[PDB]
Amino acid sequence: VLSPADKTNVKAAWGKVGAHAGEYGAEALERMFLSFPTTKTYFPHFDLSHGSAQVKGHGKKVADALTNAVAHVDDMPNALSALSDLHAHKLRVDPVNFKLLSHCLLVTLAAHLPAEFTPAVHASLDKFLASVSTVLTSKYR
Amino acid sequence: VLSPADKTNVKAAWGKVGAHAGEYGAEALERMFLSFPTTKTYFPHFDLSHGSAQVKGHGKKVADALTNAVAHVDDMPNALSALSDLHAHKLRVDPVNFKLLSHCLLVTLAAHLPAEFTPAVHASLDKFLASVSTVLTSKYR
Amino acid sequence: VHLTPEEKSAVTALWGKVNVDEVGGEALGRLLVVYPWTQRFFESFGDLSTPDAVMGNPKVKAHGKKVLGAFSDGLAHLDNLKGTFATLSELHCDKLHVDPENFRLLGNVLVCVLAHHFGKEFTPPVQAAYQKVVAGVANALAHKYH
Amino acid sequence: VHLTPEEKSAVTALWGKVNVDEVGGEALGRLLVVYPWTQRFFESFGDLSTPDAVMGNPKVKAHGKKVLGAFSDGLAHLDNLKGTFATLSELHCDKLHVDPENFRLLGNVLVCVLAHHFGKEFTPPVQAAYQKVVAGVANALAHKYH
């Protein structure tokens, strides 16, 4: 359960990221692919080289789903329903991979938001990504 | 999210366990203490020997909180609020330990419910214990 | 890993009683059912649309038999799991890229299967011994990641 | 674990730039804050009632300095992490009974700390290299469990 301060903290972070959201999402995915090679098997048909328009294109979708989650923080289950359906059901995405990308998403923010990434914000951001991840692995049936 | 069939499955299992619930809870805790020694540090003041009235006494409390969770399956967050407060806040129980006890709880049912513990029921029971565990680690602030 | 004489005795006595043609399939089957994403690694296996279809699937039991074999192999080299699991490690890690967490899961599923088959005979100390073993196999299968 | 010359170069170049008197405390501090249950192992440390209290706590920075030292020690014996971490493993596993998952967490917190301090200099490949290292340390610290 996200506290009101976590909501305030996550809101601020998104605020600062601004129009870079799409770009930071691609970087997180690249950070993941390089750091946790096993995650690459879900994108066999993607070119995962640096500068890959498919990766950049995908980071935008990722960043947008996260912004929607933020814009609807008190009902992420509802907002993220179609996405969690897609991730568990069709893609069969091992739950552990959510922790890998969430960490890479944290690393990306940290690398771009010096003043923002305080211990507290880092804690709030961590809880938000875990909530998004819980929802995303919720349809495992 | 527990499906209606999972609810039906978990209900049945509880049904069969009947008046053994308390006793099976103690066995799960003992199975945990022996199998995952690191969990013993949360019970420094407990005598954890076999036959320990404190362990048996505690398994009853555990079994009862789980029965309450079952009896209020569509709002476990509400039913388990005081307990999750206790586990995160005061006890600081590392989340990973919930997976250790949940597994031991599965093992205990399996060891006592031959006809009940089918693949499907095992799957439903698994999801219920993960839901209880999510709630129990939800107040980490 | 190191088991004590009592743990080794508790493990081997129960193992000798295992139906090697059935328990591996039962565990693989249950993994595929309890943790659905695992089915991803078995698209060639056919019907896995239901737990009944999974458990009765010929490929599954056949493949679970192999898996059990590797477990037995492991029980025989408790003191040398790394060497024993080398090629399976390269296969599972370098070729298949199976996340290691799933090795621990299957091991725990095995434990559940044993508890289900053996009942009260699968005592807490007998389990503690078996947890050391599945922990050891998982660690060894994952050496290619370390 | 085995790092390639490029990974070793990417790791050592950045490490040399690390303030050894501050980064360990920052990481320990953030662990205590992001994963609160960890504070359980530090009842003697005093005020940890707020993140500000945690980050400014003298004991914390002092203890984080030691932790960083062990990380440096590890960077020097990448090819022999088991031996290097033996006593810390017995301490952390046999005496403290710290669940290993927390070793991976602190390692990942370190990575976050480095990304925060170094910015774009902490490139994805520089991170991939550092992930191999914190993975290695965590694995070694946990040898007493295997």
Ligand code: HEM
């Ligand atoms: C932070 C959590 C995540 C979010 C918000 C997220 C978001 C998304 C979204 C928005 C889509 C595209 C939607 C559509 O086109 O229908 C997508 C697709 C997908 N995601 Fe994720 N995802 C997350 C984590 C993961 C992880 C853990 C993996 C696995 C390592 C993963 C694997 C995939 C794959 C393979 C696809 C399909 C790509 C394609 O073929 O076009 N996702 N993700």
Ligand code: HEM
């Ligand atoms: C299946 C999940 C669990 C349930 C349903 C559960 C339930 C309970 C309940 C009912 C109480 C006593 C309530 C009270 O007296 O106020 C309790 C206390 C406690 N639990 Fe749990 N628990 C669970 C898992 C865990 C785990 C993972 C650990 C740690 C390994 C743990 C450690 C403790 C401790 C140390 C106490 C306090 C005992 C005392 O000093 O009296 N619990 N638990």
Ligand code: HEM
């Ligand atoms: C305790 C853990 C495990 C053991 C002991 C084990 C053992 C085995 C064995 C003995 C083989 C036979 C390979 C051969 O034909 O020579 C194999 C193959 C295979 N395993 Fe596992 N396995 C384990 C876990 C897993 C997990 C959890 C997954 C997937 C989530 C997995 C996926 C596969 C696949 C895809 C193959 C087929 C390889 C091929 O024929 O190309 N295994 N495993």
Ligand code: HEM
């Ligand atoms: C990368 C992982 C870690 C490393 C490299 C590390 C390193 C260290 C070092 C070097 C010491 C100094 C011991 C001495 O005085 O000789 C120590 C002590 C300690 N560590 Fe860690 N540590 C790690 C993770 C953890 C975690 C995650 C916890 C708790 C959740 C923890 C709890 C403690 C405690 C309680 C002590 C005090 C021991 C005492 O003075 O009796 N450590 N650690």
